[PDB]
Design a protein around this ligand. Structure first.
Ligand SMILES: CC1=N[C@@H]2[C@@H](O)[C@@H](O)[C@@H](CO)O[C@@H]2S1
Ligand SMILES: [Cl-]
Length: 529
């Protein structure tokens, strides 16, 4: 009987729990935020059919007022085989090691003996929820050595009388419409294809993404006696409006590197050759580039204006310009300024020498830190400044690598608040390769480089749509934190500064103490209520 006893504990959801973690549930939220609870179990014998059910979470003053809970998810583990090459001091464990990341959507799971297993409870709290203290329990059941085991864990959610609606922060995660590794494989233009696209869009909006990257070149068809048909593009845009993302439309890149890292940029064009529309890359100063873009850009602008989408749209030229290919970059910009002067231009950038050439700057975080005075000047001049993270930066900078503390994902949006950057970009929503992302966590990059685990995807392939990671959850939470700090700063700018300054000490230095963070959150909620 002793060996059948289930050990149960609760762990803050900002703390990652390993299979061999040592034993150690209240959530404090605004109306409109998501509450998360992490319940952890272990047993000296194997468990079959582990299951959890959330009971009614009811208000003490009125048992009729209930919160609605999402289906319970189990934390999944992935093997991180190779490390961040320049790791942070606070790296959670040294690879190789198994890390918690995916949120699985299984009704029941098995657990091997003496393996710690986290259970993840999500409660989305609508804005019209009555403030108060909601209480209930989670019922955990399963089978051990034949016999049914069952236990109830008490939980509480305090809903503060402060409404967090849409966050004013702009957030994009670049997305690839693909069904790799899923149990479905829809063909383009099938009903299931459009249904899966809608499911991704809903996932993105439920995590406070409000920008989507959509290519006006690859989602159009061309006839060239030029006529451009944007039907496919428009279907994408409609779906992302309907599911609550758009928001803003980020136009897919016109061009890219001709070869290696310092090579000149080329632009894609469409041409009639031997009766067929063909696509090729040309120099942006070429006559072929001029002929194409003189007709395509006005068609795009006219199309966006007619649909009421022009003021929501910004166009990418070519990714990550550097000093050594700045001239070819500037030649793309010149085409767009010439033939589409009304179009806003956005770019993830390394070089800063682009004044007049772009409207929405998106420097890489360490480049922003290093050139902060330039970026603040661009803001005074009326430009928008965001930032991104990716394979870089590494070291002590915040990022969404699996090896990092979860607060480094969440505090990215505290960096946005402290330094006045009004949006955030990441390239890596779901960039799964041919190998399973559950078993091959370090994707191949340029030459001998690999991408650190966590960089290419924040969601995983489920049976028929995306599965969240814990990092996706932390990102959503930070985007809401930004809105709360912004609401406080409207009323009490000095109090908002003091609170953000407790966790963002510099661009590359933070306080990731979870107890401290929860204390700051509670002060923020108390001040606003
Ligand atoms: C905006 C960006 N562009 C690049 C992407 O296409 C990927 O190669 C990524 C790898 O981390 O690095 C940077 S982030
Ligand atoms: Cl270790």
């Amino acid at each position: 009987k002793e060996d059948r006893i289930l050990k149960v504990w609760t762990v803050d959801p900002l703390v990652k729990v390993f299979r061999d973690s040592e034993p150690v549930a209240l959530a404090e939220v605004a109306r409109g935020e998501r509450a998360t609870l992490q319940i952890v179990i272990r047993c000296a014998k194997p468990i079959q059919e582990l299951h959890a059910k959330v009971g009614p979470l009811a208000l003490g003053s009125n048992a009729k007022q209930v919160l609605e809970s999402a289906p319970v998810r189990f934390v999944g583990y992935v093997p991180v085989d190779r490390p961040i090459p320049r790791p942070p001091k606070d790296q959670l464990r040294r690879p190789p090691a198994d890390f918690p990341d995916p949120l699985l959507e299984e009704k029941t799971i098995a657990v091997d003996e003496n393996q710690v297993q986290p259970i993840w409870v999500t409660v989305a709290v609508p804005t019209n929820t009555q403030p108060g203290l909601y209480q209930g329990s989670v019922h955990i059941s399963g089978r051990v050595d034949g016999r049914q085991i069952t236990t109830k864990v008490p939980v509480a959610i305090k809903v503060f009388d402060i409404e967090v609606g849409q966050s004013r922060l702009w957030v994009t995660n670049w997305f690839s419409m693909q069904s790799r590794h899923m149990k479905i494989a829809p063909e383009p233009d099938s009903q299931q294809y459009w249904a899966l696209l809608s499911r991704y869009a809903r996932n993105m909006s439920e995590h406070r993404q409000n920008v989507v990257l959509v290519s006006p070149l690859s989602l159009a068809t061309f006839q060239l006696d030029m006529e451009v048909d944007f039907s496919r593009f428009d279907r994408w845009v409609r779906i992302f409006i309907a599911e609550g993302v758009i928001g803003r439309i980020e136009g897919g890149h016109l061009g890219g590197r001709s070869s290696d890292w310092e090579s000149p940029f080329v632009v894609r064009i469409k041409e009639l050759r031997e009766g067929n529309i063909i696509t090729k890359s040309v120099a942006p100063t070429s006559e072929e580039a001029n002929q194409f873009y003189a007709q395509f850009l006005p068609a795009l602008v006219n199309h966006l204006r007619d649909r009421g989408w022009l003021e929501k749209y910004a166009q990418h030229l070519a990714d990550e310009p550097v000093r050594t290919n700045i001239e070819s970059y500037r030649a793309i910009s010149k085409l767009v300024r010439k033939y589409a002067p009304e179009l806003k231009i956005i770019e993830a950038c390394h070089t800063k020498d682009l004044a007049g050439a772009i409207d929405v700057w998106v420097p890489q975080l360490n480049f922003l830190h290093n050139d902060f005075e330039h970026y603040q000047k661009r803001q005074r001049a009326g430009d928008e400044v965001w930032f991104y993270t990716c394979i870089y930066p590494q070291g002590e900078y915040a990022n969404r690598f699996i090896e990092q503390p979860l607060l480094k994902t969440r505090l990215l949006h505290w960096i946005n608040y402290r330094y006045g950057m009004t949006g955030y970009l990441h390239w890596g929503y779901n960039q799964w390769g041919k190998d399973s992302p559950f078993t091959h966590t370090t994707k191949q990059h340029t030459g001998q480089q690999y991408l650190p685990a966590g960089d290419p995807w924040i969601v995983y392939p489920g049976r028929d749509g995306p599965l969240d990671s814990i990092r996706h959850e932390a990102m959503c939470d930070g985007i809401a934190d930004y809105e709360l700090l912004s609401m406080l700063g409207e009323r009490d700018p000095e109090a908002a500064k003091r609170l953000v300054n407790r966790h963002v000490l510099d661009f590359d230095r933070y306080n990731c103490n979870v107890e401290a963070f929860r204390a700051t959150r509670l002060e923020l909620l108390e001040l606003l209520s």
